[PDB]
Amino acid sequence: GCVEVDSETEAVYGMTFKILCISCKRRSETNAETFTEWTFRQKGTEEFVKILRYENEVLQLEEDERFEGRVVWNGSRGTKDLQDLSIFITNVTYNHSGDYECHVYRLLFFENYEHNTSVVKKIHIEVVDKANRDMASIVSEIMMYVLIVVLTIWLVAEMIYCYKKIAAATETA
Amino acid sequence: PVRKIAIKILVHSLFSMLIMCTILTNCVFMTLSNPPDWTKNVEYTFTGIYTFESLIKILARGFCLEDFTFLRDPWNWLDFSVIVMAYVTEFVSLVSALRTFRVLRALKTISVIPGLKTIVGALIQSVKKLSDVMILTVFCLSVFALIGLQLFMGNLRNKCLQWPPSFNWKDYIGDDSHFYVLDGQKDPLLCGNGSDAGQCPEGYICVKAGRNPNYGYTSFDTFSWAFLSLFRLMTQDYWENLYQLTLRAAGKTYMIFFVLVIFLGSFYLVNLILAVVAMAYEEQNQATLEEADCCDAWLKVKHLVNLIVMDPFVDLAITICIVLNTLFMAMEHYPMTEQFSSVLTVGNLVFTGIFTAEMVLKIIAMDPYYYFQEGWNIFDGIIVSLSLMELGLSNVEGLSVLRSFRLLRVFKLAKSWPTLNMLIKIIGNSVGALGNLTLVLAIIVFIFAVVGMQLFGKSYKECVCKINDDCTLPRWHMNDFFHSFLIVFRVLCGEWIETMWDCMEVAGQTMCLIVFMLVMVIGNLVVLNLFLALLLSSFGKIWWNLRKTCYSIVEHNWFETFIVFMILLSSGALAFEDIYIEQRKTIKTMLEYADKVFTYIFILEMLLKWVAYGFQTYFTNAWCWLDFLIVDVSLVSLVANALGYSELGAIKSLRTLRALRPLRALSRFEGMRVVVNALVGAIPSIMNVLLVCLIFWLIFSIMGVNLFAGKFYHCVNMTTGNMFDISDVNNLSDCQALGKQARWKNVKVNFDNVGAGYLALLQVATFKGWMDIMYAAVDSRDVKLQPVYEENLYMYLYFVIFIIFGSFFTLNLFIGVIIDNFNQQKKKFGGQDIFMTEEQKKYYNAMKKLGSKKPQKPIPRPANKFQGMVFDFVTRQVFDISIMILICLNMVTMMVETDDQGKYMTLVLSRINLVFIVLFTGEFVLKLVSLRHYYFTIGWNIFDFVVVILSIVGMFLAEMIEKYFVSPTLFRVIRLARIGRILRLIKGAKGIRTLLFALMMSLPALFNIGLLLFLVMFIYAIFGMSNFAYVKKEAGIDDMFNFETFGNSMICLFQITTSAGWDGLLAPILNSAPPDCDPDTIHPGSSVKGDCGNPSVGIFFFVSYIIISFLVVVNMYIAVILENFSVAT
Amino acid sequence: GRSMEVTVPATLNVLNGSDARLPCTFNSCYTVNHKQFSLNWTYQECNNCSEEMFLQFRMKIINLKLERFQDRVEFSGNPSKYDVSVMLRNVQPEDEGIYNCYIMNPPDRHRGHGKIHLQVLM
Ligand SMILES: *[C@@H]1O[C@H](CO)[C@@H](O[C@@H]2O[C@H](CO)[C@@H](O[C@@H]3O[C@H](CO)[C@@H](O)[C@H](O)[C@@H]3O)[C@H](O)[C@H]2NC(C)=O)[C@H](O)[C@H]1NC(C)=O
Ligand SMILES: O=C(Nc1ccc(S(=O)(=O)Nc2nccs2)cc1)C(c1ccccc1)c1ccccc1
Ligand SMILES: *[C@@H]1O[C@H](CO)[C@@H](O[C@@H]2O[C@H](CO)[C@@H](O)[C@H](O)[C@H]2NC(C)=O)[C@H](O)[C@H]1NC(C)=O
Ligand SMILES: *[C@@H]1O[C@H](CO)[C@@H](O)[C@H](O)[C@H]1NC(C)=O
Ligand SMILES: *[C@@H]1O[C@H](CO)[C@@H](O)[C@H](O)[C@H]1NC(C)=O
Ligand SMILES: *[C@@H]1O[C@H](CO)[C@@H](O)[C@H](O)[C@H]1NC(C)=O
Ligand SMILES: *[C@@H]1O[C@H](CO)[C@@H](O)[C@H](O)[C@H]1NC(C)=O
Ligand SMILES: *[C@@H]1O[C@H](CO)[C@@H](O)[C@H](O)[C@H]1NC(C)=O
C-alpha cells in the first residue's frame, strides 16, 4: 500500500542524500492527478522560497545556485498519481541545510466530483560533515551488549552456585 | 350394506399405487414454468382423482348418513384441505391467491408411500427435544442482538458524503449521488469517525445518512434487524460481509464482539443443537433396537481359464492396472500437445480392452449368466459396457461426458480397500435402509422448490429490474423449477441471506422471511438427521559433576519461566515488522538487536540442554529436535547477515522462516503440548481417511477435468472488466482480433488439471468460493469458445452431486472415523479427558464437585420486628415469578430502542428503566434484609449484587458522560450493564442453566484448543505479513482488511478460521503474471518490489490454514459433544 | 415478462347523460414515482388508420380536450397506488369506438395495453 515515513534529518556533507515526503492517500483506489512544490529556507533565513516543482512527467527547478545541476527526482516514476515525493540531492553541501516545506497538491478524481486537496509536510534537515550514528542505534547496541554480558554473568553465577551445592552434597559418597 | 363396496376399493393395493402414481405425475406437472393451455384439463383430472380418494375415504369410516370419516388422521386433514380449496380455486373470481392453493397440493407429496409418515413423525419427536436448546439460542441471539444494537446503532448507515460548495440537508442526504459508490458494488461505502475504522477519501466526510448497507436490510439499527443479523452470524452465512461492514463503520476495535458471538452464538449453539439432535437420535436407535463334444471343449477350456493364474500377479495385476488407469485419467491436462493426448487415448483404449478381455475370461469360467450373481460382477459388467459404448459412439453431442463413468472402475478397489468399502457401505445405507429418510429430504426439498416458485416465480419475473442493473433475472431466482431447486439446495448448504435479500426486495418482507426461515429450519433439521443417521451407522570428576549442575539449571522453574518469557518476547518481536516498520526507525533497530539477544539466549539454552540431557536423548525428543531446527535456522540467519549475504534471493526467502519462532512455545506450554499430542496421536486414522477422500475427490476432479477442460477462458473488456456479449465476440479467433482490449482471461480457479481440480473442489465443498466456479462452469460452452450466460445451465447438477457425495458423504466418513478414533483413544488407551492437563483435570474435577451442590436449608429466621415477615413473604413463588416478569419487561423495553428515536422516546425509556433499576434495588435490599448476615452462600445472589452495582455505576457514568466531556463511543460501551441486568434471567431458567454449565465445563478444553489455534493464527499471520502484506487490492483484500499490519492480518485470519470468505483472500494472491499483478511496482516507503504474492505459497498457506483450522475446530466440537454426553448420560 | 398486466375488462357500457368515468389501471410491482411515468391512450378508427392522439400525461398533467371528437376529460387518477384514470364530460351518441389505454412504466421495459369498446347501452 503506502506508508508515511519521516525523512532522515542528518545528511552528510559531500555525500548524497534522499529527502522523503510521502503523502499517502486516504483511500488507495481513488484515481488522482498529483503535483507538488518544494520550498526551502536555509539555516539563518526566515521565509520559504520555491525551489522545486514536480508535475505529471518532468520536474521544473528554480534557478537558485544552491541546487542547480544538483537535485533529481526520486518520487513515483511516471504514474500520474505521485503518492511518493522524494528529492535525491547529490553532493550535499552546507547551503541546503534548514527547513523544507513539501506542498503536495492532489486533484482527486471521482465519479463526477473533482477535489483539489493540499497537504503540507514540513521536514527538517541539518547537513553534517560526519555521519554519526543515531542515538537510538547506539543505545540499542550498547543495551544489546549489556544484556548479553549480564545474562552470561547470571548463568555462570548459577552454574557456580550449583557447583558449590553439588560439592557440598555429593562429597558424602 | 353399500359402504362395504367402498372398503375393498380403499384397501386394495392397486388403489394405493394409483394414488402414488397420480401424486407423482402431478408433482412432475407442478414443475412446469409456464403451463400451456391443454395442461389445464389434466390439472382438473388430477383434482378429480383427489376427490375420488376422498370419496373412497368418506364412504369408508361413516355409515348410514354420516358426515365426517377421515378427520382423525392428520394427513387426512391435509387431503381435506387440498380437495376443498381446489374447488374453491375453481372459482377464479372467488384472485392472486393461487399461491396459497397450489402449494397446498404441493405439500401433498409427503404421503406418496407409507413409511414417510413414520419418518415425519420421528422428525417431530426429534424437534420436540429441541425446546431447551432453541429457547437458549433465542435468548443468546437476543442478548447479543441488543449488544450489537446499542453498540452499532446506525453506524452501519454511515456513508461517505461530499462537502458542499456552500433543500439544504433535505435533498443532500437523500441524493445517493453525493455518496461514494465504490467501483463495481452498487452500494454506498461505509466509513466512521473514530480511529482504526474506514477512511473517507480526501474530499468526503462520514455521515450517518441514507439507507442501510443493502437494499435496506439486516443492519443493526432495530432489534428485529439485529436479531436477523445475529441469526445470520449464528449460521455464519456470508458473515464476512457483515464483519467487514461493522468493522468499517465502528472501527476494528469492536471485532472482539464478533469473536464472542462467533465463539458463543455460532460455534457453541450449533454444537448444542447438534449434540441434542444426536442424543435424540441415539435414544431413538436404542429404543428401536431394544424393542426388537462342444460341451467337452467348453469344459476343457474352462479347465484352463479358471486355472489361469488368479491371485499371483494377475488379480493383483488387475488391481494395479486399475490404479494405472486412474493415473492415466489423472494426467488429463487442459493445455494439450499432440503425442500426449494420443498417449492418453491409446492407454484408455488399452485399458477398456483389457477390462473387456478379463470380463470375457470371467464369463467363460463362471458361465455367462451365473456370473451376474456376486454383485461386483454386475457392476463391472455395467461399467465396462458403458466404456465400450463410449468408445463405439465417439460422436454423441452433449453426452460424451458419460465417458467419465469409466472412473467408476476405481471403486473396484473396494474389493481390497476396507475404508473405501466403508464409504460404499455408507452410500448404500443412504440409498437403502435409510433411503426413506433420504427420500423425505428430496421430497421436502422438492416441496419447498415448487412452493418457492408458486410464491415467488411470477414476482421474480416482473419485479426483476428492482434487483439488477441490466434488469435481467439474477443467477439465483425461482422463475423456473430448476432454479427454485437450486436456491433451496443453496439454503441447505447455508448460503441463504444473499438470495433472501433478493426475495424480500421482490416479493415483500414477510412472505420471503417465512419461506426461507421454514426452509432453513426444516431442511437443515432433515439434513442433520440424515447426517447423524449415517454417522451412528458407522460401527567422571567434571563430566557428571557439571552435567548434574546444568541439568538442575535447565529443569528449574526459574529458568523455564525465563525461557517462556523470552519465547513470548521473541514471538512478539515479529509482530512489529509491519508495513509501518520503516516509519519507526526506533523499534526497528531495537528489535533488530533484540533478535541477536534472543538468538544468543536460544543457542545458550540449547547448549545447556545438549550438555545436560545428552545428545541421544536430545535427538530422541521431537520437541527438542524441532527447537534445534529453529535454532539452526536462526544461527544460519545470523551467519548470513554477519558475513553479508542478507540480500540474497535464497537467504532472504529463508528469512521469512522466522515466523516459525513462536512454534517452540508448543513444548513449553502445557495446553498446546497436550492438544498437539492428541492431534498427532489421532493423525494416522485421519491420514487414512484423507487418502480415501483424495481418492474420491480424484474421481470427481478427473470428472470435472473432462467436463470443464480449460473451457473457462472468457474475454473481458479491459476498460470495464466485464464479459463480452456472444454477438460481439464468439470464440478465440475474434477475441485475439479484438485489438488489445481483450484479455482472454482465465478464472484463476478452474479444472485445467487434477491440481486446480482439487483446489476448485475444496472451494466448492467448503461452500466459500463456489460463486465464480459454478458461474463459469455453467457458462462453459466449449473449448476456445466464449462462455454464454447459463448456456450449459444443467452443469449445476454436477456440483450438486459433488456436494452430496464429495462434501456430505466424505465429510461424514471423516467425522465418523474421528469419532471412532477419539472414542478408542479416550476410553482404552489414555486419559478419559484429552485436551486438558493434570492441573486442568483437577480444576475440572473440583468444578464437577462444585456443580452438583444444593443448600441444606441453612437459613434461619431473622431476629425481630417484622424482618421475618418480609423474609417469609419474599421466598414464595410470587416474588420470584414477579422478578422474572420485571426482568422480561425490562428486556422488552430494551428491544424498543432504535436509531433516530426522538428525544422524547429516549426520555420515556430512561424513566421506565429508572423504574426497573429502582425495583431491582428494592429486591436486592429485600433479600438483604432477609439475609443481612451473609447473603453470599449461592453465586446467584452475588451475581445479582454485582450486576445491580454495575448497573448503578454505569448509570452514574452515563450521567457524567452526558454532562461532562462527552464521547458517544464510550457511552455506548459503558451502557452494557443492562445486558447483565437481563442475563439475570439465567438464575431460574432451567435447561438454559444446564447448557451454560456445560459451557463452563468445556471451557478448559476449549481454552487449550483455542490457545493452540491462536498460536497457529499467530504463525500464519506473521507468515502472511512476510508474504502477502504487498498483494493487490482485489475483492477480499482491501485497505481495511488485509495482511499489511498485525491487526489486519489477525482479523483476516479470524475471518478465515471459520472458512468464511477465504476465496476472496486467495483471489488476489493467485495473481501471478503482468496481466493481473505487476512484478515491479515500487511501494512508497518500501524497498520491496511486486504486488502479487507467490501463487504456490498462497495455495499452501490458505489450504494449510483451512485444514489446520478444520482439525482444531473438530477437536473443539468433540470436546463440547463429550461434555454434553457426560453431563446428560 | 411477456407484457404488463392490466385489470382491464372486455367491454363496459355507461348510460347516456351521466358523468363518464373512463377507467384503466395497471397492477405493477415497482414503487411508483410521479416524475417519469409514461401514458398515451390510442384508438383505432378504420381497419389500419394511424392514430393521431387521444389523451395525455406523459411528463405531468397534460390535457388535450380536442374538438375532433368531444369536449371532455378531467384528471381523476392517483398513481400513488397503481391507479391512474381520467373522466369524460358528457356521454353522448358521439362516444363510440375502440378506445385503448396503452401505458408505460419507466423502471421496467414493457408497453402494456388494454382495449375496450366505449359504447352506450339503453
Ligand atoms: C463524523 O464527524 C463529522 C465531523 O463533525 C460529523 O459531521 C457533522 O454532521 C452533522 C450532520 O450529520 C452536521 O450538522 C449540520 O446539520 C444541519 C441541519 O441541522 C445541516 O444544515 C448542516 O449542513 C450540517 O449537516 C455537522 O455540521 C457536521 N460537522 C462538520 C464539522 O462538518 C458527522 O456527523 C460525524 N458522524 C458520525 C457518525 O459520528
Ligand atoms: O435518566 C437519566 N439517566 C439515564 C441514563 C441511561 C439509561 S439506559 O436506558 O441506557 N439504561 C441503563 N442501565 C445501566 C446504564 S444505563 C436510563 C436513564 C437521568 C435523569 C434525567 C431526568 C429525570 C430523572 C433522571 C439521571 C441522572 C442522574 C442519576 C440517574 C438518572
Ligand atoms: C469464431 O467465430 C467467428 C464469428 O464471426 C467465425 O467466423 C465466421 O463468422 C461469420 C459471421 O460472423 C459466420 O457466418 C461464419 O459461420 C463464421 N465461420 C465459421 C467457420 O463458422 C469463426 O469461424 C469462428 N472460429 C472458431 C475457431 O470458432
Ligand atoms: C552559499 O550562499 C552564500 C550566500 O551569501 C554564497 O555566498 C555562497 O557562495 C554559497 N555557497 C555555495 C556552496 O553555494
Ligand atoms: C535516486 O536517484 C538516483 C539518481 O537519479 C538513482 O540512481 C537511484 O536509483 C534513485 N533511487 C530511488 C529509490 O529512486
Ligand atoms: C562535490 O563538491 C566538492 C567541492 O564542492 C568536490 O570536491 C567533490 O569532488 C564533489 N563530488 C561530487 C560527487 O560531485
Ligand atoms: C487547485 O488546482 C489548481 C490546478 O493547477 C492549482 O493551481 C491550485 O493551487 C489548487 N488550489 C489550491 C488551493 O492549491
Ligand atoms: C467496452 O465498454 C464500453 C462501455 O462504454 C463499450 O462502449 C465498448 O463497446 C466495450 N468494448 C468492446 C466490447 O469493444
Numbering used by the authors:
A (entry chain B): 20 to 192
B (entry chain D): 116 to 209, 212 to 283, 313 to 438, 741 to 987, 1189 to 1778
C (entry chain C): 27 to 148
What's the paper's own text on this?
Voltage-gated sodium (NaV) channels generate rapid sodium influx to initiate and propagate action potentials in excitable cells. NaV1.3 is involved in numerous physiological processes including neuronal development, hormone secretion and pain perception. NaVs are composed of a large pore-forming α-subunit and regulatory β-subunits. Here we report structures of human NaV1.3/β1/β2 in complex with clinically-used drug bulleyaconitine A and selective antagonist ICA121431.
To investigate the selectivity and inhibition mechanism of ICA, we determined the cryo-EM structure of NaV1.3/β1/β2-ICA at 3.4-Å resolution. Notably, a strong piece of density was found inside the extracellular aqueous cleft of VSDIV, which is absent in the map of NaV1.3/β1/β2-BLA and agrees well with the ICA molecule. The small sidechains of G1603 on S3 helix (G1603S3) and A1626S4 create room to accommodate the thiazole headgroup. The anionic thiazole directly interacts with three of six gating charges (i.e., R2−R4) through electrostatic interactions. The middle benzene ring contacts L1563S2 and M1604S3 via van der Waals interactions. The protruding diphenyl tail of ICA outside of the binding cleft is further stabilized by R1560S2 and F1605S3. Interestingly, a possible lipid molecule helps to stabilize the hydrophobic tail at a distance of ~4 Å, suggesting that lipid may be involved in this drug-channel interaction. Our structure of the NaV1.3-ICA complex illustrates that, despite high overall structure similarity, S1559 and R1560 are the key determinants for the selective inhibition of ICA on NaV1.3/NaV1.1, which is supported by significant potency reduction of ICA on the S1559Y and R1560W mutants by 9-fold and 33-fold, respectively. Most of the key residues around the receptor site assume nearly identical conformations, R4 of NaV1.3-ICA was slightly pulled upward by the anionic thiazole group. This observation suggests that the ICA binding stabilizes VSDIV in the activated conformation. As a result, the IFM-motif binds to its receptor site, and the activation gate becomes non-conductive for hydrated Na+.
